[PDB]
Design an enzyme around this catalytic site. Structure first.
Site, PDB file in Angstrom:
ATOM      1  N   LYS A 101      56.808  78.251  34.255  1.00 53.15           N
ATOM      2  CA  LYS A 101      57.880  77.280  34.451  1.00 53.15           C
ATOM      3  C   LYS A 101      59.137  77.907  35.037  1.00 53.15           C
ATOM      4  CE  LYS A 101      55.795  73.615  32.791  1.00 53.15           C
ATOM      5  NZ  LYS A 101      55.511  72.409  33.619  1.00 53.15           N
ATOM      6  N   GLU A 109      64.819  67.346  30.712  1.00 56.99           N
ATOM      7  CA  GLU A 109      64.190  66.913  29.477  1.00 56.99           C
ATOM      8  C   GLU A 109      63.065  67.873  29.127  1.00 56.99           C
ATOM      9  OE1 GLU A 109      60.853  65.433  28.758  1.00 56.99           O
ATOM     10  OE2 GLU A 109      60.387  66.476  30.633  1.00 56.99           O
ATOM     11  N   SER A 164      48.658  80.754  32.571  1.00 58.87           N
ATOM     12  CA  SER A 164      49.952  80.162  32.899  1.00 58.87           C
ATOM     13  C   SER A 164      51.067  80.582  31.947  1.00 58.87           C
ATOM     14  CB  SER A 164      49.837  78.636  32.925  1.00 58.87           C
ATOM     15  OG  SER A 164      49.265  78.138  31.727  1.00 58.87           O
TER      16      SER A 164
END
Ligand code: PLP
Ligand code: PLP
Ligand code: K
Ligand code: K
Lengths: 377, 389
Positions: free
Chosen positions: A82, A104, A358
């Site tokens: 991310k 969010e 990931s």
């Protein structure tokens, strides 16, 4: 424009079109700005830790008679892919003159990545989170507060209202390849560095393009990042969705497999709905896969057959979680545990397989140990 | 041999000399073993994540009017420099034919890094940890058990790092046939200080090649935290006698004059601890004292003999910062750079306020990330009062 074949678009209220057109224009003005992408790739190297290694899991490869390689996105700053998208979008917010970053988060992973990038660039940060998710994820809430972000317990609607109310100073960071144009293309272009590194790394280890490339899919940002440079290259790309308690149990998040055509958060894509077009609540042992929709580019890739898609259950992901920890000493994120669990469902004997790790699973250790299936095992 | 000037040696029970001489011969044999250092460096690259970047901290540099670079050891697998040494020693242990791995740990970083290397090489693992540290580091304890290692909370003494080493050494002597002891710092008897340092100097070697690409010259300062001293020796060693001011920062605790600290070099005396002649916190009767620090990783009464030698010859300068100063730097870097540093490394970051660096090039060794320290920081009375504005 804004469509991956028939999927995507900007199915949003009119109060939101002013922000989307401004963002779409600013993003187009940096598609050929070498100063932007050089500054982006410098931060990815020096701040996030790129390039990420392509690690040969010998003990895992010997278990399946394959050559399993792990793209180690778990080694990035904050411990997940991310950070790639968060850094790029906040850099884009810097060029646009924004002084305030909002986003969010449900689990908290994208919230931490957003608050991290906001602190790197020295901008005010407000993270919106469900009041129930805040009380549960107290650690990630304090991570964001330590990074200087304000955590507002309540979700996406409150965050989008903030964005429109303070469009003069505020940028909204979407966490996946979902939402209205141009967010799906923006996130994918900030994440494709994964596949571009893997494309240059796999010949130095095998002299041959891989046979399989596996990755977990919810929204689809990490899979699209590693899949896009390999589209129409002969490599069998496989996305693994969250099967939950079972595909036939109604407690899952496999939007591509069991969803129907619909509109979610501005995107025409596959959404879990009932027979009356009402969106259904998803379910998954991994909070990072707890999303009712899927990225439009993944719907387009499935329709055209350029990427295959399947699903694994919660228990099978918990097994791959324990398996990689004991066999390789790598504690994987429960999200990426779905892609690792798929090593059993396909015949990989004598084949070169690349799995996209990931993120790391430190944040999932308490949930895994307290799971009734793991407790009884 | 085995000494750094007057410090070092093998001050151990006689029954341990056979294992130490075997380890010294096994280590001297792999010195030219190109396949060992290739497999070690290959695992460092692909399994640990080396090389780590040398990150320019722009907002931190603006605050201090300097050019501050952070050596990002926090980005390694497990999240600390300890993985470098844990991989090399467990690999050595596997090639020596051992079948059991034991180790000590304070905050849990070396315990996780050892269990991680043990799971990678498929070796039985037992980690010894002070009971007071097991209750405050429940996350790392469960990480170790998930990797397949047994965790034994030590209930004797102060129930911290020093007592964990005591009980672990009693295990080693009882099971010398099968068990390899992975020392987590540049301490203990020869050849452990030299082994750990040589596995960690990759930090300083990468830094020596990275800093000219960014500034065209060698830095003015290199700062690292020192308790045992493994992360500091790794970054200091290639710069010894180079003209760069090397600064090691010890744990000042509540204060160097309060009796609650871990500053072995600044407040200790010559002594013997866990097989090494070095500086040890002792009372007037030569008995080792209990150390104290907000950081469990710096909570150790001894220091590596190489650092004692470097201090005596003036090749490295040593100082200390308090718990409160380290807590401030922990919060400072989190808000200024989005990096949550280990409380150990926060001592080095706190020293930026103690040196005249207006216009200087400063490299700080960011030896780990501070996820393990989040609860200890937020629950600390000094931070709680700061939170109260
Ligand atoms: C480590 C990790 N991988 C993957 C995901 C799912 O993200 P996406 O499907 O958008 O790539 C998450 C949570 O969002 C995550 O934390
Ligand atoms: C993250 C981190 N940095 C630094 C240290 C200090 O150890 P050493 O003095 O051996 O470098 C430790 C633990 O002791 C640690 O866990
Ligand atoms: K989904
Ligand atoms: K000490």
């Amino acid at each position: 424009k804004g469509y991956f074949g028939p999927y995507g678009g900007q199915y949003v209220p009119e109060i939101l079109m002013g922000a989307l057109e401004e963002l779409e224009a600013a993003y187009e003005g940096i598609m050929k700005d070498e100063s932007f992408w050089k500054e982006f790739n410098d931060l990815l190297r020096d701040y996030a830790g790129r390039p990420t290694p392509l690690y040969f899991a010998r003990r895992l490869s010997e278990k399946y008679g394959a050559r399993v390689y792990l793209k180690r996105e778990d080694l990035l700053h904050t411990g997940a892919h991310k950070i790639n998208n968060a850094i790029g979008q906040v850099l884009l917010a810097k060029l646009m003159g924004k002084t305030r970053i909002i986003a969010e988060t449900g689990a908290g992973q994208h919230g931490v990545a957003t608050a991290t990038a906001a602190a790197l660039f020295g901008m005010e940060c407000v993270i919106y989170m469900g009041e129930e998710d805040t009380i549960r994820q107290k650690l990630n809430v304090e991570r964001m507060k330590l990074l200087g972000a304000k955590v507002v317990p309540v979700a996406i609607d409150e965050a989008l209202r903030d964005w429109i109310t303070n469009l003069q100073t505020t940028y909204y960071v979407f966490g996946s390849v979902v939402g209205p144009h141009p967010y799906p293309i923006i996130v994918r272009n900030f994440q494709k560095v994964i596949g571009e590194e893997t494309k240059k790394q796999i010949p130095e280890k095998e002299g041959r393009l891989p046979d399989y490339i596996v990755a977990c899919v919810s929204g689809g940002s990490n899979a699209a990042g590693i899949f896009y440079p390999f589209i129409d290259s002969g490599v069998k790309l496989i996305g693994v969705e969250a099967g939950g308690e079972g595909l036939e149990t109604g407690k899952h998040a496999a939007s591509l497999l069991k969803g129907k055509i619909g509109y979610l958060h501005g995107s025409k894509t596959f959404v879990l709905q009932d027979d009356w077009g009402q969106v259904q609540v998803s379910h998954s042992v991994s909070a990072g896969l707890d999303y009712s929709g899927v990225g439009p580019e993944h719907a387009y890739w499935r329709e055209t057959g350029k990427v295959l898609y399947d699903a694994v259950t919660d228990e099978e992901a918990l097994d791959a979680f324990i398996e990689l920890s004991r066999l390789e000493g790598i504690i994987p994120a429960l999200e990426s545990s779905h892609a690792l669990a798929y090593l059993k469902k396909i015949n990989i004997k004598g084949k070169v397989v690349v799995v996209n790790l990931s993120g790391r699973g430190d944040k999932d250790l308490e949930s895994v140990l307290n799971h009734p299936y793991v407790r009884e095992r």
